Amino acid sequence: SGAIYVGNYRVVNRHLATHNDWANLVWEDSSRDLLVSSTTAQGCDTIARCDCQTGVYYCSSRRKHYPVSFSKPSLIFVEASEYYPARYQSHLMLAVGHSEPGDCGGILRCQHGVVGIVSTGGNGLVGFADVRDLLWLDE
């Protein structure tokens, strides 16, 4: 679990969105595994606006933050799960790192701010949904 809190927005994995998130919906995209809802309180996270390919992510299954090198956002095949059929997920970045299903939502960040959140994983791989192109999160 986990979210990004920027301005009056809450960014979460679409597959983990709550009823309150759907009842206060701003934008959602199944192909990216992202959903954004509105908040009453102002958040403290800032979004990175850069092309970094190194950063640090939070891994809840180890209670640790790990440095990682990650690929550029791209269209990647994701196997069927209890949340989606087998499909291509867009704006996804991969890295070598530990992850488990419940790690979704952990923040990936660089020197400029938040880059994205954990969305997929494998045997020693972790995948992040990029948010750097969502310029409207800043206003």
Ligand SMILES: NC(=O)[C@H]1CCCN(C(=O)Cc2cc(C(F)(F)F)ccc2Cl)C1
């Ligand atoms: N974005 C999606 O389509 C995800 C929806 C939730 C399911 N999903 C995953 O990747 C779940 C996952 C599996 C492993 C495993 F192989 F070890 F078991 C590690 C990490 C994760 Cl995040 C895909």
Ligand SMILES: [Zn+2]
């Ligand atoms: Zn950066």
